[PDB]
């Protein structure tokens, strides 16, 4: 197996095990904050998703310093682990245009 | 089986300070948080404050005056209110409550009577 | 905070009618209330999880209806065994907050 697929592959076990430590990590930095709704796991996780994939809805955010702070992690992961992705198909498609060229 | 067990009642002087303690049987996951809701007679539920002992963080309800300590631990299964500077007001029924980390109250103890007198 | 009023705090109902219990929400809490029964020197019971979601073992009478700020209990029928105390609890927004409480007579 080539280095690109097996580091894609690599970064998606790495973004689901942040998904799942940063539910469980926001529930923790968020309850004891009056007013805060990421209190509860499973809406949690769902937020963590739409954090790393970047969507954003707004139905959920962090308001605590630490909550936010997982949250920025869970971006970075979400952002670099879809772009090893995308750079794994540019290898692919390069490496299958110079077979295509004889080189 | 019960799956939180509490005491019965627990004397305390005015000014005294008490232990209060919930032993937890059955399934036991890491997102497990337990919660402790005061009742005096005649009166409702009065939320207290929640303590997650795969961690060991406590909240507390800030409406209310700060009067309890939450401790957990792991290895007996049991989680510990300590109740402090204990007067009339703070004669209630005091219930333990697991919840899932899902919002609700799956499982309630059966509460121990608490009495401040002399 | 999130305020649950429960009013009125005592409903009188005839055996075998159908009677409804309130819950306000001061804020939208989209559907995390929870609805718990206490009889006499008992502990509270979960009846309504979620606000319409069933619990395993309660009896079939009891549901649950709404959204937003404004949530329902009814019992279907009503019997001796469901003179009690009935709260709602919201698990929206920290802290967790309980209704004042609903008595049923009969």
């Known amino acids: 197996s080539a280095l690109h697929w097996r580091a894609a592959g690599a970064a998606t076990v790495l973004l689901v095990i942040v998904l799942l430590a940063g539910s469980y990590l926001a529930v923790l930095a968020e309850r004891g904050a009056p007013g805060a709704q990421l209190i509860t796991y499973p809406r949690a996780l769902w937020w963590s998703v739409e954090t790393a994939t970047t969507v954003g809805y707004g139905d959920l955010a962090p308001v605590t310093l630490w909550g936010r702070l997982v949250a920025v992690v869970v971006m970075v992961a979400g952002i670099t682990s879809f772009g090893l992705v995308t750079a794994a198909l540019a290898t692919w498609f390069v490496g299958r245009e110079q077979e295509r060229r004889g080189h | 089986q019960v799956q939180l067990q509490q005491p019965g009642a627990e004397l305390v002087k005015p000014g005294a300070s008490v232990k209060l303690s919930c032993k937890a049987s059955?399934?036991?996951?890491?997102?497990?948080?337990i919660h402790w809701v005061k009742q005096r007679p005649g009166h409702g539920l009065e939320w207290i404050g929640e303590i997650i002992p795969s961690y060991g963080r406590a909240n507390y309800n800030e409406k209310i005056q700060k009067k309890a300590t939450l401790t957990a631990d792991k290895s007996s299964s049991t989680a510990f209110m300590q109740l402090s500077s204990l007067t009339s007001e703070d004669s209630a029924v005091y219930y333990c409550?697991?919840?899932?980390?899902?919002?609700?109250?799956?499982?309630w103890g059966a509460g121990t009577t608490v009495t401040v007198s002399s | 905070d999130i305020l649950l009023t429960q009013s009125p705090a005592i409903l009188s109902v005839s055996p075998g009618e159908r009677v409804s219990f309130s819950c306000r929400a001061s804020?939208?809490?989209?559907?995390?209330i929870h609805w718990y029964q206490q009889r006499t020197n008992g502990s509270p019971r979960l009846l309504i999880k979620?606000?319409?979601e069933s619990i395993s073992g309660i009896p079939s009478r009891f549901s649950g209806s709404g959204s937003g700020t404004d949530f329902t209990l009814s019992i279907n029928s009503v019997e001796s065994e469901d003179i009690a105390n009935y709260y709602c609890?919201?698990?929206?927004?920290?802290?967790?907050?309980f209704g004042s409480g609903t008595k049923l007579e009969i």
């Open positions: 609890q919201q698990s929206n927004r920290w802290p967790f907050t």
């Open positions: 979620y606000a319409s």
């Open positions: 804020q939208s809490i989209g559907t995390d």
């Open positions: 409550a697991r919840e899932r980390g899902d919002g609700y109250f799956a499982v």
């Open positions: 059955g399934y036991t996951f890491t997102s497990d948080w």
